[PDB]
């Protein structure tokens, strides 16, 4: 094709510049800015009019001038270019390779914003995922096609939990009873605002256990331009959905820090001078977050699936901050970390009381897992709640007033936080997690387990202490 250059530059200030004679530029197009020194920047058309078209520069505008600068059109819609050979590679936030390997050959080029999924074409998520963590596997079961963010703090180890989930994720098709062949499992890992230390830790974690073979990495650093932070989740989700819905893959998408993405969005919106929100964030933040989160799910008639585990840090542990508050309004639950358990040295420090999985009811039961899953989940939740109530009662009126049941529940809660949650680096299976759950459920009398049915009692109520 041919090349068009626009040199009618009229006004440059901050991150914006105006081109006056560019009626041919479509809204939202991607352009290339070239200065007198030969350096080429990137830009996006955020507004087009007869008088001029407003272009937002990706990088800084240093070195631009009204005499020699020229603007050229790249493409009307932002296309990435994807192929099945991207597995095992390592790209930055913009999609260029960063591992030193030569560029890939694109099988197809797709828009990065994607399209909304027709609700008629969707289907209900039904199959569980074994994350290898007892608290997640038993009480907050993760289902294929779910968005399950993890809420963390400043010093809490979110990265370690994310890496552990990536390493230990399995589908367990044999438990489904159908005995079909194992489907391919892939991990798309998008990183935003990541320092060198975190990047090195992630690279070493992926290379140590060989998990990089079935994984694609989108790693955007902290010193990278701001706009690259915006595009990284869209590139990652485009690749994930392409693989899932054109190669029957089961894809797990992990986003390292949505707080950095929200900060970049706020900075860009302030640069464009939109209507402010609750804490300076743009008013359309909910829509922007939805356009990323809603891309996960399962589609009728296809075997692929997309699962998302966003990671974010709550500022000052404030659950009412706009970022976690708006994130919760979209996803199907949340996993919350506890600083008290971190001070106790528990790992992973997941607090089960404020955690919830909305799709757990459909992804567990007979055929999917062992048929006692829901009952034992309810029983452990009730017992832990009673233990916490006893703990709070002790901290006011003393230990003297405890009944034998109360102290039994107290010691059960202590053993629970010492064994069930504090698993360290164990890759506990669903069978092992259920065995441990039954083992400490035997600590209570048979008549005290009101939620569990009589069929499972005796069948599994072996009154056995923990073997670990």
């Amino acid at each position: 094709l041919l090349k068009k250059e626009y040199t009618g530059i009229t006004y440059i200030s901050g991150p914006l510049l105006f081109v006056e004679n560019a009626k041919d530029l479509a809204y939202g197009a991607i352009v290339d800015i070239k200065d007198g020194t030969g350096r080429v920047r990137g830009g996006q058309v955020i507004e087009v009019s007869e008088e001029y078209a407003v272009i937002q520069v990706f990088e800084e505008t240093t070195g631009l001038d009204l005499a020699t600068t020229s603007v050229s059109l790249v493409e009307d819609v932002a296309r990435l270019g994807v192929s099945k050979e991207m597995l095992g590679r390592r790209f930055n936030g913009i999609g260029k390779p960063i591992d030193g390997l030569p560029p890939i050959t694109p099988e197809k080029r797709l828009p990065i914003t994607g399209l909304p999924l027709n609700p008629v074409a969707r289907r209900k998520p039904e199959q569980f995922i074994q994350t290898g963590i007892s608290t997640i596997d038993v009480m907050n079961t993760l289902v294929r096609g779910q968005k399950l963010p993890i809420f963390s703090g400043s010093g809490l180890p979110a990265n370690e939990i994310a890496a552990q989930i990536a390493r230990q994720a399995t589908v367990r098709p044999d438990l489904s009873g159908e005995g079909e062949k194992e489907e391919p499992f892939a991990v798309v890992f998008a990183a935003m605002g990541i320092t060198q230390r975190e990047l090195s830790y992630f690279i070493q974690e992926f290379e140590r256990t060989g998990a990089l073979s079935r994984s694609v990495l989108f790693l955007n650093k902290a010193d990278d331009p701001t706009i690259e932070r915006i595009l990284t989740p869209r590139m990652a989700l485009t690749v994930a959905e392409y693989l899932a819905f054109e190669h029957d893959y089961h894809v797990l998408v992990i986003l390292t820090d949505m707080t950095n993405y929200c900060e970049a969005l706020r900075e860009i919106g302030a640069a464009r001078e939109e209507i402010p929100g609750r804490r300076g964030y743009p008013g359309y933040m909910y829509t922007d977050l939805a356009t990323i989160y809603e891309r996960a799910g399962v589609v009728e008639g296809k075997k692929g699936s997309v699962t998302q585990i966003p990671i974010l840090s709550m500022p000052d542990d404030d659950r009412t901050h706009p970022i976690p508050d708006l994130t919760g309004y979209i996803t199907e639950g949340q996993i919350q970390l506890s600083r008290e358990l971190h001070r106790k040295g528990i790992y992973p420090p997941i607090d089960p009381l404020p955690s919830l999985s909305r799709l757990m009811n459909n992804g567990v039961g007979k055929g999917k897992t062992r048929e006692d899953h829901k009952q034992v989940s309810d029983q452990l939740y009730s017992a832990y709640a009673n233990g916490v109530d006893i703990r709070k009662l002790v901290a006011i009126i003393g230990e003297d007033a405890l009944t034998e049941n109360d102290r039994r529940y107290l010691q059960f809660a202590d053993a629970f936080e010492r064994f069930f949650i504090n698993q360290g680096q164990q890759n506990r299976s669903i069978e092992e997690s259920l065995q441990i759950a039954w083992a400490l459920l035997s600590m209570l009398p048979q008549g005290e387990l009101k939620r569990i049915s009589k069929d499972h009692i005796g069948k599994y109520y072996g009154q056995k202490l923990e073997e670990i």
Binding site: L1, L2, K3, K4, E5, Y6, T7, G8, E20, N21, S70, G81, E85, G88, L101, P102, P103, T105, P106, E107, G210, L212, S213
Partner: protein, 128 residues
């Protein structure tokens, strides 16, 4: 264990990249030999016609001084000013009426634009 698999994968990737770059270099060198062909005036006139079609109302057309006599006849029929430029090799550029919009039509630019689209075809031709 996975180290050997990664090594063979990167060996195959490097081989594919090297052969694709070899094809690209051969094509680029072949394009450099186009002006020596007898069809050079015809193809450059066609490129100038395409550029002028893509830019309605162009006030001028610029090209190579060697190629200027070739497009002199086309300049008269199209009724626009023409001028020479030594740096504009293997191409022709159209200048808009206001002088702020430019439309460029050159072999190297077309190759750079279409290489990404044609890479898949080249790969499937080389490896079946």
């Amino acid at each position: 264990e996975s180290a050997g698999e990664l090594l063979v994968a990167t060996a195959r990737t490097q081989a594919r990249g090297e052969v694709l770059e070899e094809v690209r270099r051969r094509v680029r060198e072949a394009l450099e030999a186009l002006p020596q062909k007898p069809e050079w005036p015809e193809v450059v006139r066609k490129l100038a016609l395409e550029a002028l079609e893509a830019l309605p109302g162009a006030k001028a057309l610029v090209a190579n001084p060697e190629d200027l006599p070739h497009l002199e006849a086309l300049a008269r029929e199209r009724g626009v000013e023409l001028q020479a430029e030594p740096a504009l090799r293997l191409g022709v550029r159209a200048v808009g009426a206001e002088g702020k919009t430019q439309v460029e039509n050159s072999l190297l630019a077309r190759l750079d634009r279409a290489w990404d689209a044609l890479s898949s075809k080249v790969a499937q031709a080389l490896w079946g």
